[PDB]
């Protein structure tokens with residue numbers, strides 16, 4: 001089993017760094033969800049029942065919110081929970097299906113300052129033996145050592161010799177990881193509201209600038225997540241020089257990086273960490 | 276006459292900030308109503324005839340809906356009308372009886388985004404000289420300057436230095452007033468369906484969170500209306516820190532605030548506004 | 551018109567050396583600003599619309615950032631723009647109101663090494679005929695010869711026979727002007743991040759020392775801006791002897807100097823320069 005599982009609970013969509021031995025695939029899906037099981041002859045989303053929680057998940061959910069073009073997202077989660085649980089669940093289910101396997105080596109990411117809280121969160125609700133019913137189909141599984149990490153951290157693998165900052169332009173969350181050498185400057189790094197959905201890239205860019213005026217314009221700024229490329233472009237227009245987007249090697253658009261990169265770079269570390 | 280009349284047309288129940296010189300009393304009653312005058316030897320509800328509209332109003336109405344435990348409420352009124360008219364009428368009648376007075380200084384509240392529409396609505400149907408027959412008893416009256424305001428706004432009087440959000444947990448309506456300094460952020464504030472009756476406080480709380488992910492968890496969130504206290508409690512469980520319920524000074528439970536608070540805080544303003 | 555306008559676009563706050571014939575007054579205000587016009591029945595900040603840019607400016611803005619106690623400042627601007635434009639605009643408007651006059655003799659200050667860039671910046675966006683709408687009120691105006699100068703340079707008027715260095719302890723910007731005789735040693739002078747807000751005076755002082763170890767301890771060091779006095783005091787504790795704060799004659803605290811001093815000393819020069 002084991003199975004390194006670096007999973008991103010992204011507020012827009014989730015994803016899974018599916019190492020798959022030879023090549024990392026991505027177990028992704030729309031993280032939009034909706035409560036209540038008992039709809040009727042449905043299909044599309046799937047009924048997820050876990051920890052006394054009852055949600056539909058899957059593409060069709062958008063139809064479930066038709067007209068309510070707002071509730072669709074549960075963003076600015078400076079922390080995991082509550083719907084995040086479901087996101088993780090369904091992911092685990094998804095990749096379970098993909099692998100046909102149980103016990104996961106769970107590695108989660110979140111806004112740096114929330115990591116402690118989130119560890120508490122998911123440990124309580126996922127650490128150890130757990131089981132879920134999806135669409136009437138049960139599923140037992142377990143995690144023994146949930147590893148938490150900083151959201152967007154994975155971009156470091158493309159961040160040439162970064163001793164500075166990663167900018168994570170996600171859904172409605174903006175992460176700033178001021179990495180130095182190869183660690184996280186807690187005392188400087190922070191997460192910013194909102195993100196891509198609620199306002200313009202330029203709005204974010206300017207917001208970022210305000211929040212991190214301590215950044216030298218010639219810092220190596222690496223932009224990841226969502227509109228990473230466009231964000232990078234705008235940041236240049238703001239006036240930052242050495243700014244780059246974390247191109248994810250293969251045809252795996254921007255927003256995929258996060259977890260994929262984290263696996264790609266740290267992998268072995270977590271093979272040791274979890275084990 | 277004059278008589279400042281801040282009246283709430285609440286979908287569950289209405290109420291009136293009865294300044295009464297020395298102390299604000301509340302002219303409240305169940306806003307459930309039913310059409311058709313000609314029942315027979317009745318009592319309890321009262322026959323209201325106004326603008327060619329024909330409705331019973333009053334506690335006993337519940338009996339009139341016995342078994343139809345749904346039609347009882349006319350909620351999610353993102354706007355005034357139509358039954359709302361009657362609600363207002365009977366209120367005016369009620370407080371008329373209470374004061375023995377006519378010309379009212381009408382101040383109405385409604386979902387912020389509907390205020391313009393509602394102004395049109397009530398101005399057409401109430402601005403100026405009007406008269407109503409209740410239980411066969413006529414009654415002439417008038418309003419000269421219907422003042423419209425945002426539903427739940429009144430909570431601001433308890434909202435210590437609020438530069439953020441009021442959450443109005445009503446019947447089947449949820450208002451979010453993102454106030455800043457002392458005004459309404461039109462471009463951010465909005466009203467949400469449904470409300471207290473149709474689903475759980477937690478459902479609302481989570482709905483709210485989805486709709487306002489742009490709210491920082493440390494925003495001053497002031498909860499008013501219906502299950503204000505319980506809502507506040509749940510919001511804390513959701514993960515909002517500085518959340519408080521708008522305790523209405525005296526023994527005047529939650530749902531009363533709205534209009535009462537509006538009078539309590541703005542009063543003088545409207546003494547100038549209406550006059 | 552003419553009107554010598556030495557204006558400081560300070561990241562904490564702006565100011566204007568209002569020569570006013572007989573005595574230089576200071577047209578100052580908080581340089582904190584926020585985008586989006588359409589709030590509603592507001593007052594306090596004013597809606598500034600210029601060059602397709604849309605910002606509120608004025609004291610109340612702090613309330614607009616309530617809780618976001620960071621975004622408030624857009625500092626470490628090793629260059630003008632973008633919000634700086636607005637700062638300048640509103641200043642011009644402000645002093646316009648103060649004088650009731652248009653065509654300005656614009657003199658701007660900025661981090662020495664950025665002066666060329668900034669000239670490009672403001673020339674493009676302000677040189678010649680321009681017009682702004684503030685709170686719905688239009689205003690046409692013009693500048694014919696924007697004069698750029700080094701931020702903090704004005705302190706020279708108090709800097710007795712300075713053949714050495716001015717230290718500008720501003721918001722989140724630290725300027726070091728190594729003046730010699732009466733000019734700027736480009737090859738030595740430079741600007742340092744961050745400034746007053748982001749860390750301690752001692753932190754800055756030590757930072758300064760590191761950046762300018764080539765300064766002899768007995769150099770005439772003149773400290774200006776923000777915590778000029780405290781900075782001077784700390785620098786003495788660091789071990790610099792002849793250090794002095796640029797006391798601005800009248801009751802015009804530290805941070806005012808910059809532009810005021812620049813006018814006070816160079817004035818005539820610019821009367822010739824601009825004309």
Ligand SMILES: Nc1ncnc2c1ncn2[C@@H]1O[C@H](COP(=O)(O)OP(=O)(O)NP(=O)(O)O)[C@@H](O)[C@H]1O
Pocket residue numbers: 008009010011012013014028029030151168169170171172173195196225226227255258
């Ligand atoms: N499944 C998907 N298909 C296509 N584009 C996607 C998909 N998921 C995310 N995106 C892009 O990514 C943008 C938002 O990035 P997002 O997925 O939020 O990043 P994230 O870091 O995974 N989430 P978060 O950081 O929590 O906001 C979306 O607006 C899309 O343009």
Ligand SMILES: Nc1ncnc2c1ncn2[C@@H]1O[C@H](COP(=O)(O)OP(=O)(O)NP(=O)(O)O)[C@@H](O)[C@H]1O
Pocket residue numbers: 283284285286287288289303304305426443444445446447448470471500501502530533
């Ligand atoms: N007359 C009343 N007596 C007791 N409780 C009441 C009464 N009216 C309202 N409530 C409480 O208030 C809850 C609903 O709040 P509500 O009256 O809808 O708030 P509102 O803002 O006045 N109405 P609305 O905003 O239009 O939904 C009810 O479920 C009750 O618990």
Ligand SMILES: Nc1ncnc2c1ncn2[C@@H]1O[C@H](COP(=O)(O)OP(=O)(O)NP(=O)(O)O)[C@@H](O)[C@H]1O
Pocket residue numbers: 558559560561562563564578579580701718719720721722723745746775776777805808
């Ligand atoms: N309007 C004001 N009222 C009171 N104190 C002020 C005001 N403006 C600035 N200060 C003081 O000046 C400090 C910051 O100096 P600052 O205004 O940044 O200098 P500056 O040179 O004009 N700006 P900059 O160089 O761009 O940082 C503040 O922390 C205050 O203590």
